Amino acid sequence: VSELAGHQTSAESWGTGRAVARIPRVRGGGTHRSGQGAFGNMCRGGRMFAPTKTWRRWHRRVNTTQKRYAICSALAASALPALVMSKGHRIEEVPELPLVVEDKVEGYKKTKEAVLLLKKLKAWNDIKKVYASQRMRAGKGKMRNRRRIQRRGPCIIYNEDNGIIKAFRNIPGITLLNVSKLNILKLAPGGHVGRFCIWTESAFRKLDELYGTWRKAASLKSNYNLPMHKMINTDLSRILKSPEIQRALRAPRKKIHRRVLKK
Amino acid sequence: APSRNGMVLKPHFHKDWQRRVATWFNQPARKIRRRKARQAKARRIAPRPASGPIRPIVRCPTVRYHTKVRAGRGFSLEELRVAGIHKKVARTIGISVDPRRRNKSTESLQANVQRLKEYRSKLILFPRKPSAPKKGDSSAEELKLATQLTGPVMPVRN
Amino acid sequence: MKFNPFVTSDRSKNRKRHFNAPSHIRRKIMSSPLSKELRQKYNVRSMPIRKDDEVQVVRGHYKGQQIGKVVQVYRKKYVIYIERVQREKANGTTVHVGIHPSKVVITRLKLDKDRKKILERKAKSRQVGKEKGK
RNA sequence: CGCGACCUCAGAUCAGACGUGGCGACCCGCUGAAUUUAAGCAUAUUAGUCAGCGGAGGAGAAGAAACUAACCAGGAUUCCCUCAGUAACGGCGAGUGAACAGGGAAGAGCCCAGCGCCGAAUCCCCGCCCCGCGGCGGGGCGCGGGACAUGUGGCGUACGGAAGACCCGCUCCCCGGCGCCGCUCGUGGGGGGCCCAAGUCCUUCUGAUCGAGGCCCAGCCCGUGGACGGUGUGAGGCCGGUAGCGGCCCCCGGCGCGCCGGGCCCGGGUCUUCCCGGAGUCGGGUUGCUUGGGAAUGCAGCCCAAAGCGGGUGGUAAACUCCAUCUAAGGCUAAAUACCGGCACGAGACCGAUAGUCAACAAGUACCGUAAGGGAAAGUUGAAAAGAACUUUGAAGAGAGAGUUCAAGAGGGCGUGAAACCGUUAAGAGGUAAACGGGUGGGGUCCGCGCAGUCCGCCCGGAGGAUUCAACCCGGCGGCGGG
RNA sequence: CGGCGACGUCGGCUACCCACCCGACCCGUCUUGAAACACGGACCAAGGAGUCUAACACGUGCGCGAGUCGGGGGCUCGCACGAAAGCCGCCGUGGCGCAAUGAAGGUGAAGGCCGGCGCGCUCGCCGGCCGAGGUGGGAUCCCGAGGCCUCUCCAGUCCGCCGAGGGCGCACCACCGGCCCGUCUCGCCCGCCGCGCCGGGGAGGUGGAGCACGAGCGCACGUGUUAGGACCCGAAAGAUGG
RNA sequence: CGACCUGGGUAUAGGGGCGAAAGACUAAUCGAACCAUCUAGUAGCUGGUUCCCUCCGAAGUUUCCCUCAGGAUAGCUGGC
RNA sequence: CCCCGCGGACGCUACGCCGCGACGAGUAGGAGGGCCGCUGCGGUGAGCCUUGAAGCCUAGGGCGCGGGCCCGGGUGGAGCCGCCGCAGGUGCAGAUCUUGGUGGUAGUAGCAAAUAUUCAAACGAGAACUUUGAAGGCCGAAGUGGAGAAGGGUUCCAUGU
RNA sequence: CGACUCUUAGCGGUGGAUCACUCGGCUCGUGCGUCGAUGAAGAACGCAGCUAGCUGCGAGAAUUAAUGUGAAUUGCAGGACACAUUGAUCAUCGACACUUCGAACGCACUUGCGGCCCCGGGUUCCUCCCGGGGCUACGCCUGUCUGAGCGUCGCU
Ligand SMILES: [K+]
Ligand SMILES: [K+]
Ligand SMILES: [K+]
Ligand SMILES: [K+]
Ligand SMILES: [K+]
Ligand SMILES: [K+]
Ligand SMILES: [K+]
Ligand SMILES: [K+]
Ligand SMILES: [K+]
Ligand SMILES: [K+]
Ligand SMILES: [K+]
Ligand SMILES: [K+]
Ligand SMILES: [K+]
Ligand SMILES: [K+]
Ligand SMILES: [K+]
Ligand SMILES: [K+]
Ligand SMILES: [K+]
Ligand SMILES: [K+]
Ligand SMILES: [K+]
Ligand SMILES: [K+]
Ligand SMILES: [Mg+2]
Ligand SMILES: [Mg+2]
Ligand SMILES: [Mg+2]
Ligand SMILES: [Mg+2]
Ligand SMILES: [Mg+2]
Ligand SMILES: [Mg+2]
Ligand SMILES: [Mg+2]
Ligand SMILES: [Mg+2]
Ligand SMILES: [Mg+2]
Ligand SMILES: [Mg+2]
Ligand SMILES: [Mg+2]
Ligand SMILES: [Mg+2]
Ligand SMILES: [Mg+2]
Ligand SMILES: [Mg+2]
Ligand SMILES: [Mg+2]
Ligand SMILES: [Mg+2]
Ligand SMILES: [Mg+2]
Ligand SMILES: [Mg+2]
Ligand SMILES: [Mg+2]
Ligand SMILES: [Mg+2]
Ligand SMILES: [Mg+2]
Ligand SMILES: [Mg+2]
Ligand SMILES: [Mg+2]
Ligand SMILES: [Mg+2]
Ligand SMILES: [Mg+2]
Ligand SMILES: [Mg+2]
Ligand SMILES: [Mg+2]
Ligand SMILES: [Mg+2]
Ligand SMILES: [Mg+2]
Ligand SMILES: [Mg+2]
Ligand SMILES: [Mg+2]
Ligand SMILES: [Mg+2]
Ligand SMILES: [Mg+2]
Ligand SMILES: [Mg+2]
Ligand SMILES: [Mg+2]
Ligand SMILES: [Mg+2]
Ligand SMILES: [Mg+2]
Ligand SMILES: [Mg+2]
Ligand SMILES: [Mg+2]
Ligand SMILES: [Mg+2]
Ligand SMILES: [Mg+2]
Ligand SMILES: [Mg+2]
Ligand SMILES: [Mg+2]
Ligand SMILES: [Mg+2]
Ligand SMILES: [Mg+2]
Ligand SMILES: [Mg+2]
Ligand SMILES: [Mg+2]
Ligand SMILES: [Mg+2]
Ligand SMILES: [Mg+2]
Ligand SMILES: [Mg+2]
Ligand SMILES: [Mg+2]
Ligand SMILES: [Mg+2]
Ligand SMILES: [Mg+2]
Ligand SMILES: [Mg+2]
Ligand SMILES: [Mg+2]
Known part of the structure; x- marks a missing residue:
């Protein structure tokens, strides 16, 4: 808000012996404003409490x-069908x-050839879901240039730009990302992992050089290596049913003992 | 009031600080603007190095940094004398010169003159009139080998 | 989408430019499509509406195939008046009903030296675009 | 005993020029509080801040060491990070508080006075002619005036400089045009003008539609254009636009070449001989202020008042001694940096008519005060005025009909239309003011497809249909196992 | 197991009005104590008060980990989003941590056992090993005599459970030793290009925000304290300029 | 008929004026006018401080304080 | 060595489900949970909507301990909401609170300083108040008369409403 | 029985909450970064066929010219306007013009009064009256002209 808002009035309190609240009062006469409260957050036309300031961090x-x-x-989640489906990306017929x-x-x-490619990869149903999702935003965002909202479509990841960006970019929901410049804001659009990503072969091959293996450090980040698992085998059902675990267990106590009515 | 254990704090906010607050919302715009100026300057001096004149090898002053070598303001007049470069010609061919630096030791003097002689060998000089080359350079190598060097000229290296 | 950093997509600004537009660009705003025959005869799609050209209304209460000559281009109100597009008022006289020029198609152009210049102007630019994207 | 020269002054509506005042967000020079904190309060803090005065520009100021250091040294200014809430200051309380080095942004250096040399080599003004106009310049001419030896110009300034010899290299500058480039540049350099894709297709919703279904060939059409706005809804294809190293037209600027007008005039190395500096200033005492600067950081007043192997600095006063470092008392200088005023733009996890600027509107307006100054309230008919013709009562306001509209149960302060409060109608009740909690009862409005009250698994019996039930054959696909 | 069900009745403790019985003083606030003859409140609508920055402390979550952190800068078509994101590594300068102690000059954290020798003189030269000592507790882990089994026994074939005792002992706690810096007391040796008003070493007390095989750094969130208008509203005043 | 009453023009301006003196008057304001700003001045003092349920649950005592309507401190509380 | 039957309920959002036992006051204050509520942002609901959004009204049907919420009917006429995260100028009965609106008081107090009006007529829808005439009074020349200064600024004068 | 009062509901008033909208703000960023004696900022008064405010403009007054544009403006009226022996409107804006105060400039202002030089008219040159035009501020720089001094001198 303006630093001057509500504080360009020259108002002063009337005192205490005049049967009115001790709030500052606009001086003068001949106008409605005269004798009205000022400067207070409770006063109409006054200063708001703790005015918002530009250095909010x-x-x-x-x-x-x-x-x-x-x-x-985000990348590892984009290769699992359950997570990509749970983002609602209609990857039903994707090869x-x-x-x-x-x-x-x-x-x-x-x-046209960008559209034809998406149809032939069975990724067109994702675009049609974006089309079905085009509606108006609810609330004050319409007055604030965020009039339209729609669903997120598939993410096209490329190594080079030889016109692919211009070929796409008129397709609603399609976001193009250079593999060397991955954005978590685009790979996990709402903070939820599982965005549908179509990869170009050159971008796909550069992925090992970009983030490394667990036995190679990344050759394009000079100090990065893949994060390590704190749980190698996350198959709880298989671990629990293993004969090693089952041999060490005691027998299950499955009879339910309900309260006995004291006769 | 003090409350239990804590650090005795002395904030310097008694002097109406809110009227002199420098926000940095123009920092991304400032980085863009300087980068445009850098690119425009490089184009203006088309074959000349983008960073600018060659700077001398300089040892840092105090006992904390005197094991470390950096780049200085300009080559000394003594350095130019034994390198055979006039102090008024050097600035026209990309050699920075500092008239107020003296050479207390020969090693620092002798290291900087090899820097000058070696830079002189690496230098390609275009004739003032391209049609008539007096003593600039052979056109065979000044045509194809002429390239704007990026980064500091012969970066100072510990 | 829009990439030019000097043209605004702000809704308040675009509305403000539209309703406060000077009459010489209100003419361009008040353009109408040509009929299929005219769009085929001249290699142009739209045309600013003119005083004495004759159109048919394609939207609203007065839709039909009847051809009415434009009788007034009242740019302050962004409407045009057509011959038989009118209604009776209470006291029995007729008043023209203003309709937006975007809701008519021009079946016939009032042709003078200036329209013909604009007509070949638009067609030539379209032909350049066709041979650029061939 | 007048006439001349000079000096110091004066007048002029003398010829030709310049300053004044405004804005003032940012900048420079002064002046400069108190509220406040210290739980009182005087030093301190607030603060070199508010207020006050002066002066600028697109930036200003600063700036090329009388520097930093003490190292193996760095090297103008300005800005960022850090140094660092540190050294230090402080009723050593509250509080205050830099610098160097390091890493970056940017990077650019120079000119006089003096000392000397050169026949004042110098400059202004006025007439005449020519080339031009585009901010008024160039060239030539004048026994044309003036400035100036009480000192103009060239060379030259501490990084040393000059003059002579000896040797070497002849090496090549800047200005305004003629015609044309590369077409000026991340693909125009800028300013202005005018243009450039595709559905108003079929059936339907509606007052209106931009809505809903559909559009064979992998699917209506364009898409480098699916930003936005308008249009009777809610539109990529209706319109303006949007995309595009898209088109055309008009205007302006510095860039290379051949020529033109004129200037344009020796550079380096060695040796020798010479020449080298800013004074009521520095510095000292004292006083007041200021600073982190503490036996005194800086600034200023008064008194004293310099030197030249000198002077300044070397963060504890002083004497002696060595060492380091710079060279004050003259001047200019772009960039990086600042910008709550101005011109023109873009955007936003901001506000949404008691909010957001005081001001969404004939707002610094109406209005108030002698004045300085104070300062509001106030948005919305409808898609379109189609803004109610006409009849009738009344003097009229106002009504009853009629009419427009999808709607006036939208009728010119008219979208929606809450609560408080009021009128009327309906129901109920009423001498302990109303109101309330718990428990029932009566009445009433409504709800329950209430009104002969579940469904469904197997089996038994009766009366009918349909294939085909099982098992085999062929084919396809899965699950599991396999040295 | 019984009765009753369409234009009259059936069910609906909720909700509307009324009646009766019992209970029931008007809220907010200060206060030992409010229904108070204590203050504010006629009614309704809308507005209206712990916020943001900075700095600490502790807790929690995340990444990396004796490191950690690019926040300033730079590089990436210069820009729909994108003022974002990505990258730098001789951009890690620097910050914090990795060392403390003293006013300072300065100094600055390894012990245990086995042997021959001076004199194994509370001790000096070495060897060899191991690498922060020991006591008492100490989750967990290890060994474990002896038991628990089958239609039965002479005789062991494989492992499972209970198990008295015993062992290694995490973290942490108490205590005793040891090491570093300051300062006292005592005392004897050693070193040399400077033989000195030189330098070093020992034993015993005591001062330290220390060592004793690191835990920190960055980011986020919460709480608490503080400086700021500082939860909101409120003086009598003071100053400057008109 | 007088140190008389009164118009207009002038002069004196805020810690100042003016006062046959009452701290009177100085634009309904005077034991220091009015206006704007510093300023959202400070307040240990008064008033207010906005949704629900669940769990736990006090103190008016100690010591020190220009301390006695306030703090620090220990105690009592909650959370981890 | 299941087989005349080839068959055999539910479960286990593990942040889930189930069992048993004890317990339940609370100001100041602390903590937890909230499928309580408001506004906006990133995702998601092939969400809703002119075949009617928001808002508002309701003797309508219900749900929750509660904050609150869902559904029916009416009005209205263009937008809105659920879930996962994110962020606040996020919840009112008070503050002699701010602004706006409205009551009782109440058809009440009151429309009482300076002697005074009456008759007839005209215009007019309409006459205690206008105009004319008649009568009775008052100011009583230090005026309730006739003209100016200051100040006001068109109030002056006709006609009309 | 009605009145009155209270509760609830329907309808109607009063009032303007709520909701939806937004040619407005607020904040951030970018590029430029330009006033004035050649009269600025500001003020006053005027200017439209019908016009009070706002806006625009300056006695050429809700605008002239020029250029782009290409048929309007519009509340009503009027008259234009072959759109080529050139054009409505709008935009741009480089030509022209731009009243009185105001640094404000002849002197002075809550008023008014001069002086000098030209031109025209009454005069029928001589200077009186009227009108028109141009000048008449302070400070200051260079130069010019006119001067002053028992300032320093020179010659007579
Ligand atoms: K300190
Ligand atoms: K001369
Ligand atoms: K177009
Ligand atoms: K002094
Ligand atoms: K010296
Ligand atoms: K207001
Ligand atoms: K205003
Ligand atoms: K309506
Ligand atoms: K009370
Ligand atoms: K960074
Ligand atoms: K480090
Ligand atoms: K130390
Ligand atoms: K606070
Ligand atoms: K004033
Ligand atoms: K008098
Ligand atoms: K005073
Ligand atoms: K007491
Ligand atoms: K949503
Ligand atoms: K509930
Ligand atoms: K509704
Ligand atoms: Mg406000
Ligand atoms: Mg809403
Ligand atoms: Mg105090
Ligand atoms: Mg206090
Ligand atoms: Mg005090
Ligand atoms: Mg100031
Ligand atoms: Mg000035
Ligand atoms: Mg400057
Ligand atoms: Mg300077
Ligand atoms: Mg110098
Ligand atoms: Mg530090
Ligand atoms: Mg200070
Ligand atoms: Mg640099
Ligand atoms: Mg000279
Ligand atoms: Mg189009
Ligand atoms: Mg639209
Ligand atoms: Mg559209
Ligand atoms: Mg374009
Ligand atoms: Mg010393
Ligand atoms: Mg407002
Ligand atoms: Mg509203
Ligand atoms: Mg009336
Ligand atoms: Mg309606
Ligand atoms: Mg209404
Ligand atoms: Mg009622
Ligand atoms: Mg109280
Ligand atoms: Mg009491
Ligand atoms: Mg009470
Ligand atoms: Mg009592
Ligand atoms: Mg009280
Ligand atoms: Mg009240
Ligand atoms: Mg009261
Ligand atoms: Mg509210
Ligand atoms: Mg970045
Ligand atoms: Mg380092
Ligand atoms: Mg132990
Ligand atoms: Mg111990
Ligand atoms: Mg704490
Ligand atoms: Mg005081
Ligand atoms: Mg406050
Ligand atoms: Mg106050
Ligand atoms: Mg004391
Ligand atoms: Mg009290
Ligand atoms: Mg309880
Ligand atoms: Mg609030
Ligand atoms: Mg309220
Ligand atoms: Mg009465
Ligand atoms: Mg009365
Ligand atoms: Mg009488
Ligand atoms: Mg009279
Ligand atoms: Mg009259
Ligand atoms: Mg009503
Ligand atoms: Mg014109
Ligand atoms: Mg006079
Ligand atoms: Mg004389």
């Missing part, structure tokens, strides 16, 4: 190792979810 710094580890989690296409796509120039 809007930004946050996140450790680089944090941020790289969010990208790795394979770590979904990789030939480098020829990077050289696309027309939107």
